[PDB]
Structure 1
Amino acid sequence: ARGPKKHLKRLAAPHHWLLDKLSGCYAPRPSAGPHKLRESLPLIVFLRNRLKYALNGREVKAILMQRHVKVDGKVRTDTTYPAGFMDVITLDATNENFRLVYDVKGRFAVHRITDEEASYKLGKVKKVQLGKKGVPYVVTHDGRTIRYPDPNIKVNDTVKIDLASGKITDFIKFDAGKLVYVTGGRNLGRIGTIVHKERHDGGFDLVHIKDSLDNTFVTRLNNVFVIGEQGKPYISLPKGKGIKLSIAEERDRRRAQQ
């Protein structure tokens, strides 16, 4: 190619979107934004294929141009805006608030939250550095640059950000025993507690996580997201609380409830 691409084939789209393979030939390409293309849920998919409020892309555009949708407290009018992990989506007309958190299966879930919980979000500190004029700042996983951070905040920590002011209200250090959420790999969507961080210089650090059922799994440090102390997450968790269940157990539960 001679420049950036602008089209996305349906078969090439992220699997977790759960798009019909025969509905069309193209899928919404997420516009540039806070979250990476493959880790993001464009607003069209959320409003149409998840909430079912809109029956087609044109109706999604009609909804957005009415300014009814806010992402992290700010109105967005782009159909393919890349909403992503820990993003608060507010619909005032419906009096509804959502937080985009993976379910255990590895797909963004329709998780409703309260207004108080919609006032803040969490962000993994991806970088900490001095800017111009010697003003320290932290860069989080959604591209937010926050100046004058608490000096104790280091990389891999999780900062609680207030959406109204975009200021750090609280922070959580990365340490053993902390409650974490897996945001990548085949263990995506699971919740557990750190046991041990294996450090390899010049390579990828691995973290061993123990879930509530005592199962243990190893994941790269890039996919880990601290969300609180054990049993006391800073956010309301989805149904199932991030616990993986074997196919037989899922069958048993499904038959029991049916």
Structure 2
Amino acid sequence: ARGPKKHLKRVAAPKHWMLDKLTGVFAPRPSTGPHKLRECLPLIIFLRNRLKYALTGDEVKKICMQRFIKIDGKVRTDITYPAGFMDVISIDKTGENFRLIYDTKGRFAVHRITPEEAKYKLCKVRKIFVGTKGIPHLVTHDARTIRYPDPLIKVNDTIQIDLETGKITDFIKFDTGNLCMVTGGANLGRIGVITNRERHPGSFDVVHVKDANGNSFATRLSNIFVIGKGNKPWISLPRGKGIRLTIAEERDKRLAAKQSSG
């Protein structure tokens, strides 16, 4: 091609969006933003496919124009704005807020939150460096950067950010025994506790995680998002408590739930 693309095909859309093959040829094609296109929900398929607020694409355009959808403290009029991982989606008219956390199957699940919970939001620092005049900057897994951080934050760590100030309320050091979350790969959307980290010079580091049920798994270091201070998470967990159950026991889960409600 002679330049950047601006169309995404429906089939070429990310799998976790749970889009269907028949309604349209194309896909939302989220605009550039804080997060990559492979791990973000455009607002169109959050208000039309998740909450069913809009029936087609023109209604979600109209409601974005009416300026009630406030992402992360700021209004967003873009129909295909990339929401991304654990960003606050506040609708002030309904008085309800949302947190975009992967479920146990690695998909962005609808997760309502309390108004006091949405006043803060976690982030994962990606690169630490110092700019001009000896002013340390600190970029995060979003496109955000903040000046003058606490020197006790290193790379691949976690920072608590309270909204409308952009200040570090507190910090979580990426360490053994601290509750984390997988953010990619096969084990995407799993909640566990770090047990070991092996380092490979010049290659991707590999961590080992053991969850509450004793199930152990591994993933690359770039797929680690520490959220809990040791064992207590700093964010309300989604339904299911972030444990991946095998194919066997959701069958009897549905069977027993159907029998109990029938």
TM-score (norm 1): 0.99
Hey, what does 1:84 align to over in structure 2?
A: 84
Hey, what does 1:50 align to over in structure 2?
A: 50
Hey, what does 2:30 align to over in structure 1?
A: 30
Q: 1:143, 1:25 → 2: CA distance? A: 30
SS in 2 for 1:117: coil
User: For residues 77-97 of structure 1, what are the alpha-carbon distances to aligned partners after superposition, in whole Å with 9 as ceiling and x for unaligned?
Assistant: 000000010100000111110
Give the counterpart letter for 1:116 in structure 2. E
Hey, what does 2:224 align to over in structure 1?
A: 224
Q: 1:14, 1:57 → 2: CA distance? A: 19
Structure-to-structure mapping, 1:200-219, within 5 angstroms: 200-219=200-219
Identity of aligned residues (%): 72
Where do 5+ consecutive residues of structure 1 fail to align?
Answer: none
Structure-to-structure mapping, 1:93-242, within 5 angstroms: 93-242=93-242
The structure in which a higher percent of residues are strand is 1
User: For residues 231-254 of structure 1, what are the alpha-carbon distances to aligned partners after superposition, in whole Å with 9 as ceiling and x for unaligned?
Assistant: 310000001111011111111111
Where do 5+ consecutive residues of structure 2 fail to align?
Answer: none
How many equivalent pairs are there? 258
SS in 2 for 1:208: strand
Mapped contact 2:177–2:231 kept (Cα < 8 A):
no
Q: 1:218, 1:106 → 2: CA distance? A: 15
- How far 1:164 moved relative to its partner? 1.5
Q: 2:214, 2:230 → 1: CA distance? A: 13
SS in 2 for 1:128: strand
Q: 1:24, 1:194 → 2: CA distance? A: 42
User: For residues 147-201 of structure 1, what are the alpha-carbon distances to aligned partners after superposition, in whole Å with 9 as ceiling and x for unaligned?
Assistant: 0000000001100001110111100001100000101011000000000000111
Hey, what does 1:3 align to over in structure 2?
A: 3
Q: 1:67, 1:165 → 2: CA distance? A: 21
Give the counterpart letter for 2:229 in structure 1. E
Q: 2:130, 2:186 → 1: CA distance? A: 36
Q: CA RMSD in A?
A: 0.7
Q: 2:228, 2:63 → 1: CA distance? A: 35
User: For residues 49-76 of structure 1, what are the alpha-carbon distances to aligned partners after superposition, in whole Å with 9 as ceiling and x for unaligned?
Assistant: 0010000110001000000101101000
Q: 1:152, 1:83 → 2: CA distance? A: 29
Hey, what does 2:15 align to over in structure 1?
A: 15
Give the counterpart letter for 2:165 in structure 1. S
- How far 1:133 moved relative to its partner? 1.6
Mapped contact 2:193–2:231 kept (Cα < 8 A):
no
TM superposition outliers: structure 1 runs of 4+ over 3 Å: none
TM-score (norm 2): 0.97
User: For residues 122-160 of structure 1, what are the alpha-carbon distances to aligned partners after superposition, in whole Å with 9 as ceiling and x for unaligned?
Assistant: 111101110122110111101110100000000011000
Deviates more, 1:229-238 or 1:174-183: 229-238
Hey, what does 2:62 align to over in structure 1?
A: 62
SS in 2 for 1:193: strand
